[PDB]
Design a protein around this nucleic acid. Sequence first.
DNA 1: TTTTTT
Lengths: 71, 71, 463
Amino acid sequence: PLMTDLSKKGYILYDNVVTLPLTTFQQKISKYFNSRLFGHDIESFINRHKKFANVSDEYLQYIFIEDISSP
Amino acid sequence: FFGETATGKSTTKRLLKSAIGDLFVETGQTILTDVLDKGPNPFIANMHLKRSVFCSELPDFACSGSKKIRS
Amino acid sequence: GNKLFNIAQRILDTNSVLLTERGDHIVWINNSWKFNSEEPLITKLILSIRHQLPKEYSSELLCPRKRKTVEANIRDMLVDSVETDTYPDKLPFKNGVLDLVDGMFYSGDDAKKYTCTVSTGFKFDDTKFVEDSPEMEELMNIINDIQPLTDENKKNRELYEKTLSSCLCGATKGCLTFFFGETATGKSTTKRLLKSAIGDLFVETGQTILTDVLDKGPNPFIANMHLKRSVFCSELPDFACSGSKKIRSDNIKKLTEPCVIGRPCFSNKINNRNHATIIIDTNYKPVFDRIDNALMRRIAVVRFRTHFSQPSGREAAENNDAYDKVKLLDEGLDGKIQNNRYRFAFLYLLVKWYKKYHIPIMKLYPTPEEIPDFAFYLKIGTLLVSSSVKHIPLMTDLSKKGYILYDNVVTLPLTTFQQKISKYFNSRLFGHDIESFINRHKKFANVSDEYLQYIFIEDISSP
DNA sequence: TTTTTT
Ligand SMILES: Nc1ncnc2c1ncn2[C@@H]1O[C@H](COP(=O)(O)OP(=O)(O)OP(=O)(O)O)[C@@H](O)[C@H]1O
Ligand SMILES: [Mg+2]
């Protein structure tokens, strides 16, 4: 039911699961975390944690707490 | 058994194990996704005359790089 | 009244057989404690002690089966265990114990109160344990040839005669010694002399105890040094060549602790007592995996600078920088050493040296200056000082030098650190050290912000 | 893998 808020931020629900654009995860990670010191951790997280429903869409099944805050 | 979080699924484990005792046994995800005929496997020796075996806390296998179950 | 039971009781009342913490049985035979896990020493004691028993008991011990019965009784009556090897300043022999404090020699019951489970393996002789003897005059010549009595070599000679005298003590030593020198300098002659001096208390092992893991499976090379007082490792390879393994930095830390974990074959005992001085003779200086402060306080080095050469190759030897003097070689010395000619004179000299350095207290100290690998880590502590709260008021001067305040702490960004550090160390020879150092102490305030928590001492003095 | 261990 919270997608009513997520759609206000432009977030999307594809294949009946909530997903965010990838570029959004890397900009949030860069804006809150230092790339130089945790690049290996971020890369391992993304590589071992990526999910896809078809040959074109790749997605993660998680939502930032900051996204729940009202815009 | 399929369900969501906080759904008494782990409670039924306790109700069954209290009802059975030592015969009831737990297992993890280490053995179901790995070949049991290769290398030592204490579980292969352990299930000897066990009455029931329960497997839970399975990580989602849809993630890329997560090694799916071996049928 | 069972006769054999009475014999067992009388034997037990003499305190001639004891049970140890490790489960062994120690027997007092021929003025020495002996033990062995494969031979029946108890029956030997029973047969030997028969002369002290009354005449109606002695004839009963001639039958082996009755000796086995008495052995079974004695095993049944031993229910409590005792400690062994608690006196560090006693030197046990095959027929007595020598006191290193006063110099007296004890035999019989006087030596029994010191429960020593090891010995040199040969009998003590007071006739040859004297100062005035032709062998002593000969031996002093070799000792002076190896270590000259000159002013530049004084400190090294004192360290040399401290490490050797440290081998008579049965305590734990906190440092390892390296005998460094070029070929044909007498490094092995002192090893042979010390072996002939101390007998069974000497042991030589392989190089795996400095390179491999000591606690994977059976390892007799580490379990054969239990209760020994001198351990030698010989001829480690040169690490410049490819494929050579380096010395485990954490292995030498375990060799300093009083207890060492190791297991023999077909054994369950995993604890070994550390009483040994560890000496490695080398032709190349050692290389370690990691350098830290805990490593630098456990290494000592002794130099050898005298060359013994045949007359054919003398001319080259005088043109080598690695030598300070050249002397003619003696081709008959090794046979004399192998014949134990200089045994008791070297023992007397070792006792004389022991009275000079270790009577108040016994301790060994490291010499970190000798190793060239440490020279970087030693120098940094004298050039960089850690940031402190007291340095805040002085930053008015530090602003002109390029220092920046971050989180109310004096900080210096990476970009300006390199040219400051290049004023002391050359890039080519110390590139790997400063790279490793910078990566192991870099801190970032943000994605593009860099800073280090050190300040130079030369920067707190006004130029 | 094999000495290890039995
Ligand atoms: N004082 C001495 N006078 C004459 N010859 C001596 C003296 N001391 C030792 N030598 C002789 O020097 C020779 C070489 O010494 P030694 O083998 O101990 O040298 P080293 O430096 O330990 O050698 P390496 O490490 O290569 O085995 C020996 O044959 C020995 O007899
Ligand atoms: Mg030698």
